[PDB]
Amino acid sequence: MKLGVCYYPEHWPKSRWVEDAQHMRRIGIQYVRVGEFSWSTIEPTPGELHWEWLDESLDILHSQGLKVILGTPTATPPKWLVDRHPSMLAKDEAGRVRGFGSRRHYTFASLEYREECRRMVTMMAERYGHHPAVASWQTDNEYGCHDTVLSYAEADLAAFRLWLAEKYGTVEALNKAWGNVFWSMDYRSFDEIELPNLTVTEANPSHRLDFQRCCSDQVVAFNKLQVDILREHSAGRDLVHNYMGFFTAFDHHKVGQDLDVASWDSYPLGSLDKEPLYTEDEKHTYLRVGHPDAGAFHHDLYRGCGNGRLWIMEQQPGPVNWAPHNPTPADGAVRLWTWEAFSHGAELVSYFRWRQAPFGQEQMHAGLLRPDAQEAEAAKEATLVAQEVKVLAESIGLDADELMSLPSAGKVALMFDYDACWSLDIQPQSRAYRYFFWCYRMYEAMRELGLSVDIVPSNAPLDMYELLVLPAQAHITPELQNRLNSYQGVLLAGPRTGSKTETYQIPENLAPGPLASLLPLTVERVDALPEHTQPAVSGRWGAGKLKHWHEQIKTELPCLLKDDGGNPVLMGEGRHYYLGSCIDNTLLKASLAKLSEVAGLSTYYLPKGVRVRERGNVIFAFNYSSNTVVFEPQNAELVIGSMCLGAADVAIWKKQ
Amino acid sequence: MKLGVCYYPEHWPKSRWVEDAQHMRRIGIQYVRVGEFSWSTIEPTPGELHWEWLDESLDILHSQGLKVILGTPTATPPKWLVDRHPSMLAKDEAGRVRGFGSRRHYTFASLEYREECRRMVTMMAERYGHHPAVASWQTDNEYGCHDTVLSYAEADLAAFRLWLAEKYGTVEALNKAWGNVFWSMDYRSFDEIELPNLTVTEANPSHRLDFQRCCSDQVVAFNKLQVDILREHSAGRDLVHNYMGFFTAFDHHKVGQDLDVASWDSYPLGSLDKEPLYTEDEKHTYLRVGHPDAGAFHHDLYRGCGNGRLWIMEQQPGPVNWAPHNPTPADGAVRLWTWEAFSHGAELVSYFRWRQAPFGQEQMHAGLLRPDAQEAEAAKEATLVAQEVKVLAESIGLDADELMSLPSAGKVALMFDYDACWSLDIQPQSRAYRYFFWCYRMYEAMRELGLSVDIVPSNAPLDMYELLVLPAQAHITPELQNRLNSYQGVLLAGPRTGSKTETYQIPENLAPGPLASLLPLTVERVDALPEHTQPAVSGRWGAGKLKHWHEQIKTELPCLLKDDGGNPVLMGEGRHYYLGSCIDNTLLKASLAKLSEVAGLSTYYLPKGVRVRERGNVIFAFNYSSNTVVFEPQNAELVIGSMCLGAADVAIWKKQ
Amino acid sequence: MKLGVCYYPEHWPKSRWVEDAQHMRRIGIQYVRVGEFSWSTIEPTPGELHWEWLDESLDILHSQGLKVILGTPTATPPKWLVDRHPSMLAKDEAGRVRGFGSRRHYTFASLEYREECRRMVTMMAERYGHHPAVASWQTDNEYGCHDTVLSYAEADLAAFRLWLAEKYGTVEALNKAWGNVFWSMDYRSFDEIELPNLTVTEANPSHRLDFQRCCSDQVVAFNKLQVDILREHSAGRDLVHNYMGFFTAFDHHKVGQDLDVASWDSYPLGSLDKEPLYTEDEKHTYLRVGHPDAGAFHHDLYRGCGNGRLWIMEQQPGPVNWAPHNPTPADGAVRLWTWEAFSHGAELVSYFRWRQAPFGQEQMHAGLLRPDAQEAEAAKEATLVAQEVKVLAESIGLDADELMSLPSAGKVALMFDYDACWSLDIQPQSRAYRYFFWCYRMYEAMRELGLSVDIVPSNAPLDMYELLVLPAQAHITPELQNRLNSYQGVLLAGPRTGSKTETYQIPENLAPGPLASLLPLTVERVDALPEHTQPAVSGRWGAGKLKHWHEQIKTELPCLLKDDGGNPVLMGEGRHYYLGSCIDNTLLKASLAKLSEVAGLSTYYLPKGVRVRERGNVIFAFNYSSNTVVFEPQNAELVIGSMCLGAADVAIWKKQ
């Protein structure tokens, strides 16, 4: 439970630097990120290097006891470098070059830019890898931001053809896997295969899925080259990357295998206003705090990506610049979001930025300070959180390190698979269906029942979970099916689970494919629905509606929910259940409450806008609504806040 | 009244083939289409040909008594061929190449691809043109699908400049016809003229119209080269093409002149969900059956294009893949659509496909069988229809061939002109006005009055029709005006009739141009309206509103409808009437009922969702609504179904 | 499971009588009611008696094997009798005489009319009490109809003053019990006490409650005088009265103590249209069948009043005359209502009337026949039910008598108390609160969960019930509290339970009064709410809203539901629970499902408009909706109807 800030000493005169560091310390900041956009300062023209600024900045930060997270500057290479390597530039889906003048102007497939990255990261790692200020390295900055994973340039095609040869061996094997007999798509060789953009009409879903996988693998490779250098020259330092909200274009679990920590960038007001996930009512109700699960969903996903280790590298401190509308946060919201992250096991919450810049694209993005260096609202809220974590630590008899080590895992797991996300986005089949939205709405229902949750990859060990939910595990690997067969907890498999092979085909036995041995049923066909037609649901466990996706199923399993035609909606017995339609929020909660009971877990329908999470003996309660509500856990005493939770407020209790 | 199926033996192991054909026979299928996407199977690399698969498949189908429709494979040429002929690829309106990886990757203007088509079609026609299994040939597959008529590549421009020289002779004549004095557009030569895309702002409507005409003519020429080969080498076989719903980019009457049969591809649930024609209420009400006139409109249009001969080459059997939302059809809907087609004179209704494919873009498109070869819903419904046509034939004392020969023509004609469609789409003048929508809504009103209808081209002989409606015959040829002058039935000319010359100019006498001698009036100007302003209408024949298009007219003709300012809306006497505003559904029915009475035809305001059509002494009744309704024709007896028409149900009566 | 009809031989020429009886037999009618409106036929002028018509009618009915229910004619005494006894006439609440010219023109307090009733009932009972046709007697006809229990004439006041002396002994005791120190209401003697109508403003609730009790007791006494005569002179005959839907002005349990059978008069379409209980949506949705619980609620209440024995004396057969709107029933609705009554244990369902009368107030009230003696819709539906009960009896190996003896009791009891109803109607305290409505809505929730229910009086033995619900048991007698203390099932006490003493005062310990020893809580005060303010509810068992009544409670009991202020809504543990607010339908079902689970009973959220009830091994299913829905009970086989329940349809299954 530590605080941090993102800082740009290169944006401010050196006469500010000592004061900045002292002020950071006064607030309770312990970690500071620098360097990720500094390449033009380091090397304004090739071979003429400027390290003095950074040498001095790191010493000043160290002298105040601040631990530094050093960013490699590869997100924003200089124009002289771009001009030397025209093949490094990405092309968008429309076939146009994505040029210099903003950030992230490269394709991950560019071998020329990778060699330039090897040079610069080696230079930096050799100079600073053993500097006593440097505790951690951030590779690059927000891989994929602005939809930069998929690129449609010559370099991307060259990498794709090599990647396909490695996967399939022969083009004959690829043609069989893709079903290229269809529409006479058959290739004579790998070098006949083109990019999947700018086709007359829909490209083969197998083609598009393998393309996504390849592009994701280029992110893995790009990151891995930096990691290898940093392991060699900066032993003992935590290697981290900063991931984003509402972003699925590369496999974050796979990138995470090469790193020590998963960090992410949380801007609850920007995501609420911008994202089509949210309803009009939600955008209005939660304008100044964000949706109650916007941070939570990602804290749990990225704790999984980090193999237990989660940071927030960038936390919203005030209004941002980049959403269509940019409201000021509610008073107390920065405190709210900070404690929120700590309740999900975040080691560190780092704000961004330290001081609002008066120039450039983000001149309207707030910081802890205003552009004139006077304190803004987040400075006082951060100060309060730092005081409150000391109060908490003392109340439960722990030091800072023991506090951070409190357990964070939930006993309910939601399985999120990037490969499934890509498959389902490629052919949603109803335009109202989105894998991410469905996962998020299943998660919201869990959270409205007061459950503490882990979000896990498909290769995760399952033995520590009493309830396991697979919202839409489109392809089930033979190894996952083995883990499911031996799993001793309660399983809910959601619609479209086991509906696709590895190469984007329908399984020979139809959906749910490998799962059918565990859960004997057959999806005969799919009724894929618009928003305006929502069939009625009834049965043993509740009544309500279904929307978007409506599987027509034959089974002998007992039915817990059915439609008016008597067709199975939710079916199962003992410890195994299958859901074939996207049931509404009411029915999601009804079903999860029943399943939780089978699994030996308690549930509680929390008040609207209220959320709870546990870390060992500590209970964290949050109120995202605009009015005071009472939350009183049983057999516990108040440590921070009150039983009457204010609007945008936090209370912390300890079990007796 | 025969059944068919679209089949892909190349998608299934040869061990399935005998069983497939036997199963088809058991259902009552008599015709089978194969081959239109098989070029990569036939010729995977140039000069290495594989006919054995098709040789064997045709023999197996023949041995079960199935008649084969053989498709030329030119819709989907292989990648090796594309790579050899880069000039064959189309460009979209934005100037980007439309690449390989889907289907229909060629421009019709490509002379290089036409020679490759000449080669392959000659090869196929020589091998199979006298095979006893082959009853018919389909040229290509869905000309124009995915907006592939208009293309903006070098080959298209080259063809356009030649086409313009042929039409005009001199560039001086073209400049006069287009009015190129306007905005200094004058060309010194044909080779100065560019494509009409990527201009600063709106291109000359004359330029855009001649471009559409030229592109349409390239479809005619592309098809004609295949027809000439097939006439030579496959005498006696029916030559057919498969047209689409809601598609107007080429002249289907003109392509039809070179063929024996017009077939089309009916997907009522896809078109309902996808097409902006339909209201929100219609999309909801008819979700699982399609709009009551969606098939009907096209059955009548394409019966005209086929000079009496209509097939449905592709009939929806279950949920499809390609619309934004893809619901399952109502139980009985496949039967409904099949009888519907038969009521409009369809010789053959062919489903698609036989077995749902587990791979490729359309893996979620249903068939008569599921991907595991078990029967899906359409198999049972098709079986029932086959039994019901035998019952019908026996009840009226006819054999199968006599049944098919029952008369199909209506005594009401609606004139549809592709050239008018292009003109009116080029400058709709109110964005709420669409030629196709207006034609469809005039047709809907006729159908709600129980009328059996022909849709006819502008060169059709008129003597067999008692009532003739020209919804918006923008240009009237001198030859059409002569036919109108001598026509002895009742004429209704709709708004914008006779408003344009051949070369996109206003006639010298103003609208309605050549029609003014028959119907003396002057359109002084047009009030072109948004949806929110719908002026009131009253008069001799009814009251209601007008929308979208509101002509200000001077006439001495008697007025049957007028606006509140007393301006003529519907005017005429004896057997000739002009309508100057787009009157609402109520007023359309009021007016058509009056006009029908003058023409000696009866009308009946059918219940909501109910439709009727006659073939000689047979009455076909349909219920597209969700509830039971009573339909009882006078002086007739029930043959199939009931007087209480169920939801998505059919009844068939014979006159006494 | 027998059929009956209400018949008026005195309305038809004697030439019809033999035919009427034969026709009744053909339909399957076994019981016939006659005589209850015949006093002017029997005695048109005093002392001149005409029995010949009835002597002959009973013989004709007997000769066809029809069993007769003979009605005493005291509901409609003749004008000559009224003119002789002006003190017999009631006065309404406004002080006006309620005159001759309709029916029910007497006050139950009139001693003069009671002596006239003694005379006539003795005359009838002596003549017909041993007639072999007479199986049963109905006393009077619909006691209380047209709000005739409360009357405000001199006779009512005289009876009230005597009744008060009997209850209290001294006026001093009455003044103490009523709290007449308040507003100087103290009486010096019983003869100072007036009727509670026409006061300046609100009368003492103690005064109004004792007045209701007294008036109810006059109904008991009026009925008891007839019962005593009929016991003496017609031994072995079933004595019955015909009660009504939605009528609470006398104690039906107390009247029932003196009778053998409780019968009632069910007009589902009239009650739906007329009663303010029902919402606008319900009135529209169920127009032609009635609300799904309209009959059910009363079948269960009156089975309790009949100590197990329930008849329907009058069943709607077609449109009635008396509601503001009078629709025709849905086709099959009469069958629906008949089977409905049988599923609740009705021995007999009797229609009304046999033939629609062409004269008088009810000339538009349908019968089994039209006024011209041709069959109407109910004749065919009744015939079908008679055939179906024979099919049922044979399928389960029972004779008619064994069929009738099938068990009927539910394992869930809802306690209905007329005294509580009067108390709560006297001061509802929120105008949106009504005891009857609350009981009905608790019952609806039980029924939507598929539960079979008993409705019981407060003195009922409780040992046969696993779940017991007291919706609002305002006063708890010491004897009821003893029964609750020893009850071994699950108890839910609803809001306002134990809130009043016997004499309309707040208990000394506050609400819930005697229940507080069992359920320790204190109602500190009441928030009595309009419809527009419905506080949010959350907690262990669900989320939703409360309306109308919102008790502010202090308790140490665990809370299963709470409001946003953390105030208890539903509280308890083990087998005892208290509900303090009128929670919505969703929360009622959530709570009843939990309570049912504690009690060892299963629940099922049935489809909308569907209801189920059991009698031993027989399962009765009903569909009150307008569309087909699937109901399939487990471990059972179909006997009558189908798994696909049609609109207004019935299916009957037997357990395997």
Ligand SMILES: [Cl-]
């Ligand atoms: Cl900064």
Ligand SMILES: [Cl-]
């Ligand atoms: Cl991307």
Ligand SMILES: [Cl-]
């Ligand atoms: Cl096929």
Ligand SMILES: [Cl-]
């Ligand atoms: Cl096009």
Ligand SMILES: [Cl-]
């Ligand atoms: Cl009668």
Ligand SMILES: [Cl-]
């Ligand atoms: Cl009353």
